[PDB]
Amino acid sequence: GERKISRIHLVSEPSITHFLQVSWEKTLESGFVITLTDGHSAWTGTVSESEISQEADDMAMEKGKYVGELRKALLSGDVYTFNFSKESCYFFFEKNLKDVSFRLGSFNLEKVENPAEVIRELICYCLDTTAENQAKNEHLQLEFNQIKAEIERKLAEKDEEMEQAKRNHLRVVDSLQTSLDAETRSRNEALRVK
C-alpha cells in the first residue's frame, strides 16, 4: 500500500503545524487510514467505503467527484480549511471558494494510546523516502555530469576535424596557386625576351 504525509494548519492553534498522514491500499475509494499528529499526541481514524459514499450522498455529490475532493484536500500541500477538536476527537475540513465555503468531510479520530510509536514509524518513513530520493538525485546527476562531459568531448574532436580540413584546404590551394602563378610569369617573360 501507499501513503502520503502532508502538513496542515488547523484553525485552532494556527501557530502550530500539524502533520496529517493518509494511507490507502489501492485507492482512496476503497477506504483509507488517516492520522493527525502534533509533536506529542496522535489521533487515528479509519474511513470505510460506506462512510465515503455516505458523506458523498449527504452532500449530494457524485462519488468519484467527492473522492477527487479528498485527494486534493488530504494529499497535497488556501483552498481547503482544516479543523480538529480534541474533546470530541472530530476532524472536519471545508473547501473555500470565492466568498463561499462548504463542509467537505467529517471523521471521528480515536486518540492513539501509543503516540510515540506512530510518530517513530512516521519519521522512519520520512527518513527512508528522503534517502531513496537523495539516492535518485545522486544517480541522475552523475549520469548527467558524465554525459555532459562526454557530449562536449565529441565537439572537441569535431571542431579539430574541421580546423584540420580547413588548413588542409588552404595548403592545397596555396600550392596550386603558387604552382600556377610561377608557371605563368616565368614562361611568358621567356616569350617576351625571345
Place this chain on the structure above:
Amino acid sequence: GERKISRIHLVSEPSITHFLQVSWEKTLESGFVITLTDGHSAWTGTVSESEISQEADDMAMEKGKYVGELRKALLSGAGADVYTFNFSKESCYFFFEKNLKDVSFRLGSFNLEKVENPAEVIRELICYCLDTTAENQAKNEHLQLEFNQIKAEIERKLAEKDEEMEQAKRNHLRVVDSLQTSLDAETRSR
C-alpha cells in the same frame, strides 16, 4: 549549516528505534549539537571544540582519527564497524562504544539536557525531512529535463557540424577542380 538524522538502537530498549540528530556549522571538528529522541521525549546537548580535544586526549587519540570516529558512529558511516550506543535517563548521559573481536571500549560520552518541549523538536525534525524530500524531487525534475534537453542537443549539433564540413569540402573540391585544369591547360598550350 548541515545536519544528519540517524537511526540508532540503544542497548537498553533494543526494540525501540531511537533517532539521533547531529547538527554542525562548518565541520564536526568545530563542534556540534546532538539530540536524542524516542518520539516522545528529547535530550539535547552541545559539544564544543575543547571537549572534543579533551576526550580525544583522555583516550590518547589524534583528533583527525577521533573526529573520523564521530562521523562513523553518529552519522551512519559504517562497514563491518560495529558501534554500540547507551543512554541513561537518570544522569542524562549518552555514551557510545566501538566493538572489535571480543573487545569493547568507551569511545565517547556526552551530557544531554532533557528538552522541556520535545514536541517542537520533533515537529522541526519532521518538517526538515519533508522539506528535503520536496527539494530533492524538484532537483530531480529539473535534472531530468536538463538531461533530456542536453541529450537531444547532441545529435542536433553533431549532424550540422557534419553538414558544415561536407559542404566546406565540396566547395574546396570545386575550387581545386578549376585550379588543376588551369594548370594542365597552361602547361599543355605552352
